[model samples]
Target chain A: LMTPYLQFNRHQWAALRTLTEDEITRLKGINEDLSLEEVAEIYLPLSRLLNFYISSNLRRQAVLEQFLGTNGQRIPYIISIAGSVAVGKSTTARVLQALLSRWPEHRHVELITTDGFLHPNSVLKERGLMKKKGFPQSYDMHRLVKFVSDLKSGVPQATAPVYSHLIYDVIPDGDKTVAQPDILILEGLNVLQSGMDYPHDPHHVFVSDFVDFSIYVDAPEELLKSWYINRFLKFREGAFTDPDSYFHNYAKLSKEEAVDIATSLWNEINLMNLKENILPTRERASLIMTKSANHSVNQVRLRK
Target chain B: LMTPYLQFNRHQWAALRTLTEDEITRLKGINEDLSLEEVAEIYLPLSRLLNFYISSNLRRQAVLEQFLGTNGQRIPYIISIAGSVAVGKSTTARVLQALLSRWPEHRHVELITTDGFLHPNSVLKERGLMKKKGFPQSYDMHRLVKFVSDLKSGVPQATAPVYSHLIYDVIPDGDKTVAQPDILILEGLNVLQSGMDYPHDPHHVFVSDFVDFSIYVDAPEELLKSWYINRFLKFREGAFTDPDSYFHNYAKLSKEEAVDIATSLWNEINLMNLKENILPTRERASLIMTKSANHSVNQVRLRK
Candidate 1:
């Protein structure tokens, strides 16, 4: 049940971790099927390892407290997930949150995304920041800071705003409230961008400040471009065709045109953000999760 | 002339490279009764060094533009001054601003304190953040970010609300405006605190991000306590004695009683912030100005 590294060549993967051809195909969900064996063998060990690390951190804190002659309570553990668009980070966050919560000590888990902190479209328009939206300066940093601060304070309840992909704007004051949680999972593209000293800098605290641990989903630049285009195509056929969809205009484009536009958007904007802001911070993370073109976890680099 | 480090013994001070004792005392103006030196040796070299750095930075930025296939454009440089209360950081900031502005490359300098970004007294009362006013959660960080961001983005006439130490509250909006400048100087006690992730998490970004360069005025902890007490006494006699002053209640106290009260406040609040939130970020700065018991800059540590 070992998780295959994306970097493994076919022959090496076969030699090191012997999975029958059917088993490999099933693990990858090639026919839109789930592979229970793959989940049990691969993710189970990963989850166990994470649990061990969490417990170890608690123990270390205890030891440090004794040395300092004070007993401060354990702080909530925050984990941030960041990656390029369509690198499967959202799915990873969902799966990890589910698996982590299955552990008795980590059942009170919560997930938050930076999307909720983005300024409403109206505000962006008023400020002429529509094109700069999601450029690190677009989010309401102050509110974001307050939210995370409240979470760390161990408050009984806190709420984060909700963002709608369909509408392409943050619903004003639409909140996702939560009670006390042992672990908080935060996922976003530029979650780790440092605060700007420049004018009109975003008001929120960068996600890096709050995260106790972080994992970055990684893929080759070309593969990420392809994934983004493919995702856009899927949306065009399924969701974008709906009259109410924000991207409804893109639905009527031919497949090749859709790919061209998606590729252009990816290359010009998302890729630029990734290369300039998001990916540079990968060195700052606690773990790096590299993926294969097929969207399987390929290699894991756990920070020492 | 060189200022003697407060922690150093006479022998150690003598062993270090420095100006003669007479020249040092003359430059530092230790005896205010004496006439001011027309050209103090203490500041001239330091100012020259700062000028050099700023010039070099601008030159490097120009080179960067050339590499980008563009022409040089003005970029606002921001400097932040942070330290324990009454460590003379305000004076240091003023002195540096004056000195830096004298240089042709950075003549248009403006100084803003984080104090202005604090929520109005009325708002703080409504939010029940009065007691925690300077505790990091008390500021309107979103507005602060917007203000700085606007200034950085080259908004020519951006304004910040004024704060009155006499009134001890943020003046209502539209009261004052700070024009954009080539260099901005931000000074505050908590200017260097990092961002907090949780409501109770003590570590959070306070106002440290806007800094292109920063200076922490350092002194022995005990010396800083004495300085705070002395400064409080001055304020009590001068500002606090005014009927309209927020601290007028302390104006009637005897000298000894005033010192006691000041000491208590220092230990309970100001000292706690200095020890925890402020002092921790000293290492993150580009420069540090060490001060003596007399509140004179003794040495400078420029980041290598």
Candidate 2:
């Protein structure tokens, strides 16, 4: 059996947090204010440990090639980050992309967000999945699985469609291509779910199978709800106010009216998806980040 | 998505008894001592029902062929008999084989016992599995699975090595070849155990997956123990006392001493194996025959 994981405290984590203050602030999401100290306590240590292990794994690869004669078997290391909406998955992903690239061995680190795999709006409306957006049902699992599998095949090149957060949909004529990245970070809400326990077809591989390492961002249900509402309020002043934005009308509401609308959306859609879909995939992650009400990382758990 | 099975009682079972006393008696095992009354009440109805279903399935096969316009996809109907040692699995198999053959539609019925699949005594001793002889682990499941899969293929002839209970081992030069039987009965102690739940190799298939139907014979642990010990006592007077027999010295023991040895062997090996390996497979069976204190089947259950 495998041994259990060990935990690290803020001071201990900070000893490995080797990021610059300016980089941390630039990676923060809308309304997600990240002080240098906050990044030092969480993301900095995480990146350092990953860099440490990546080099160690490279040694294991050599050993396997020598004794096991598995030269062509080694695949790129995959790390996954899964969390509910408004939980800063993008921020954590951006920070890792920066830190991992700092190590010369990982100069080609690439980050992929599953939001790009969602169906086009017209297809979603026709299929009656418009209300289930960001839920597991909303994404194209077949294409997403194929993309991750191709990433594992040691192939020369792979590409995925790009998404536009400003328009709340996939971008037109946008594609991101990669050619053998040293490291890949997959970020999504449903990235940690295991394949069906008793599959009718053996080839039905899910996104979870491609992950070598994973992090699940966790918080209290109430805290996550408020965080989502808060992000919506900030977006009304920024992205939503753009003349061509999907939610442009929200920019005109009074603060009180906007708050009420955010509360209703969270209760009816986001909260239901979190409870019924996102939270169930938590225990499947390799690492779990539990946050305090202040939205700071207070503790972490790792798989045994 | 599979549907549940239907059940029948011993009385309801007799209503379908379409065979004669001479045939049933001829099929009985040594020391099993089944009367005409009991066989008529239990197996006659079973064979009748099996024959009914076999004919109906043949019609369904024809319908499927016409619908798909495909004619090469059908195979024999396989029925498995699973139970504890000395609990009459062979006897029930013999009766079903005899009765089903009486139906012109089931003229090509064939029976295969899995005892032939058990590793030889020399191999068992070499692997430290001599004492675990009748346990599932002592048998070569790979060969048995392949043998049944070939039977299901309904191609030309397929053969299996034969074992001799007279020598208490696999015969050196005996094999049974079957060529596309109408109904195939696979009899064994662990016939209903499914394919590996955590298999590293995807091609593995178990005895459970190939059968169109299965029967599990069950009784109280106390009664089964008594039945096993009693059979041992009978063997003492016949096979055990023979110069060529494996247990020749057992016949020399005093009657009281022989009883204790049989009881100990039952508790230590067969009973433990029954509880841990065989009985757990009961729920997976399509049909169950539960015997009473008198060793006559009193109730029947079909999967529901």
Candidate 3:
């Protein structure tokens, strides 16, 4: 593939799985299809590579800040997992958090899903942006950008509206807060989509500006849908059975019906997001990970 | 929701559930998912209505031929099933063939999938139209037109290529021959799109000109994706597992991978056909069966 970055298939990649079977089973949602081989080949080498960038970037940031007449305090490095829904990016984000937390420095490492940054379900319904989830308009961009800004500016305890996957919506008062941390992993479909000319101004504070390093997960659209629908079927047997789950009604459906609903949601909403926002950000990423249908990281591309 | 036709909910339609369990099961593709209720509620009433038109049109044809001093051989009535992939239109077509056969007229009813009229796999590959199988350009318009023309012109027999869904392509020397069928049911993706101007001349023949009536299988794009992906997963456990199947490689995939392939095929090919070729002809169908994600044809629209 013609790209600005070096692309490596899973065989060519430099790392292998270090996470135990129990750890892999415990870390991801019941819907995620994560594999030991996937973790080793894709995420293990990835964390080390990210480690290389994070440490060197910190040393560079300090000199740049000092030269611009600022304090020596280091901002939390923002690492984003920007990819289409059902591409297993959330698992990637969680996997990264696990690896990065092993840092011997003992500095704090935190993770957040951009689902928290989206408007509450009711607000989105009222504004007719419900069908447009994963799109820019559905997100409280002002709040999200400011949250990133505060994290970078080292604010004392900024908060994000906590989102619940079981409920498939944000819990109104449920919020997650972070003070100063060594690293913050942000994950979402639109993390890398904020363009230089967007949200109404040329000199606008774009999201990529605050993101220290963003990795775009790339795969064929067909493969992504498979991952999504595959996970959706499991939810009928897994999460949707929970009494408190938002999709509890799905419990009444045959496994066939649940697969149908998930496929539709993906086709009408999530897939649309990939075309309009997520896929376009592929070339914009600092690095890109391409996975085979088996969830193996067959290729890795990093931009020059 | 807004259209220029009379729409009836399935419940509001009359005389349903005329098929026995074995008959319904025996008629359609093994992989096709269609409930007995679906055939009765959605397809049963359609056969009755098409019968009304077919017989009446036969009478009208006799009188017209006499008035114009022509031969009295009333040509076969052609009914088409125009729908996207995985909409269960094939089952509807087969179901109608079963019920219509019971007519006292005993007019031999024959069914043909337009897949039979598609260009040879090699021809399509050479044309670089491999991914365009569902699109109009990949079909042999002349052969398809000629086949239908011979039938409507009261030819004693007509032939069409035979295909195997398991192999996902046409079989060389595999021919389906129909001899003087009283009623022919043609099922395909583009039956509605034999435009008002075709064959490049005045009085130029068109596929639609020979179609006495057509039923458009209707649903939201999201619903179609669900049915497609859901069925696609099941095929991996069924058809794709066959050693002779061209898609046998799909047997190696997790259910998730199968779904991914089906979903994007819907997004990129099937849905595009709906928007460009199918939906625009919504008003052209003599009947339209509208289904929900449950495989329930909730509404029926008949052009008035």
Winning model by TM-score: 2
The most accurate candidate by lDDT is 2
lDDT of 2 by residue, B103-168 (tens): 887788899999998888888889898889778667877788777766665556778878876677
True contacts kept of 2: 0.00
For every candidate in turn, the CA RMSD to the true structure comes to: 18.0, 22.8, 28.8
Question: Using DockQ as the measure, what is the rank order of every candidate, best first?
Answer: 1, 2, 3
User: Residue-pair clashes per candidate, as listed?
Assistant: 26, 0, 8
lDDT of 3 by residue, A1-304 (tens): 2223444556656522266666666555432556665666566777877776676656445443442333445568889888888887777887888777766752588888888888888998998987887787788777777787677656657788888877777887899878778889888887765422133321233455467688888889999998888777766667554887756777888877778888899989989888866786675577888877587777776642
Rank by lDDT, highest first.
2, 3, 1
Task: Go through the candidates in order and give each one's DockQ.
Answer: 0.02, 0.02, 0.01
Predicted candidate 1 versus true structure: per-residue lDDT over B154-226, tens digit per residue:
4556677778878889876545566757788888776666533223433222344345567777888999998
B-chain TM-scores per prediction: 0.80, 0.90, 0.87
What local lDDT score does residue A270 receive in model 1, on the 0 to 100 scale? 85
Least accurate 10 contiguous residues by lDDT in model 1 chain A: A1-10
lDDT by residue for model 2 (A184-301), tens: 9999887864332223332233565456678888888789888888889878878554788866778778889999999998889988878866786675566788787777887766
Q: If both were scored by TM-score, which would come out higher, candidate 2 or candidate 3?
A: 2
Residue ranges of candidate 3 with Cα displaced over 4 Å = A15-33, A62-70, A195-203, A239-241, B1-304
DockQ-based class of model 1: incorrect
Q: Which stretches in model 1 have alpha-carbon errors above 4 Å? A: A1-304, B1-42, B69-73, B173-175, B197-209
